């Protein structure tokens, strides 16, 4: 169950964090799951402070890296 939709970054509401959280909750559902990242535009930060004001996307990337691997559990299975 790959992402397949990272380009759908956000609405005008700052729901992107909730969206990515739901993505990883769907990940935790069907625990043996591997998430493929298209790695296009939701991976924006080249320098972390110069691309597109570091706005919505900077929060998205911060959340993504924060939750990417919290050493949760082996049984989690999220690759």
């Amino acid at each position: 169950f790959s992402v397949k939709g990272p380009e759908l970054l956000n609405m005008y509401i700052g729901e992107s964090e909730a969206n990515v959280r739901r993505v990883f909750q769907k990940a935790r559902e069907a625990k043996p799951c591997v998430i493929f990242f298209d790695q296009i535009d939701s991976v924006a930060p080249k320098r972390g402070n110069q691309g597109d004001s570091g706005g919505v996307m900077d929060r998205i990337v911060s959340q993504l890296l924060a939750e990417l691997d919290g050493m949760s559990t082996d049984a989690d299975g999220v690759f």
Binding site: G48, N49, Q50, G54
Partner: protein, 103 residues
Amino acid sequence: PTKYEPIFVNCPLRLRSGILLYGYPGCGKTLLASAVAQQCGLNFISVKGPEILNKFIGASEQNIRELFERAQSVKPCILFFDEFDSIAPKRGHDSTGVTDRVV
């Protein structure tokens, strides 16, 4: 100053409050800050210097005020600056870059 509360009520002079720490690169600095936060007598929030140095003129300075406006709104806080070298202006006066604005 907090534990010995009654005496410090009599203090007629502003309490020493700021401390700075050099160190050979990364010899335990954020972890120390984290622990001194977790003593929990004070709340903690922190900024990492390269995060806020936007190219945009306004945000570059507005992001500093973003911290204080929240800190003053809650409680005594640490307001730790990591990577503070990157904010510091290297005593620059001629170029008058955005760094001068921020400092």
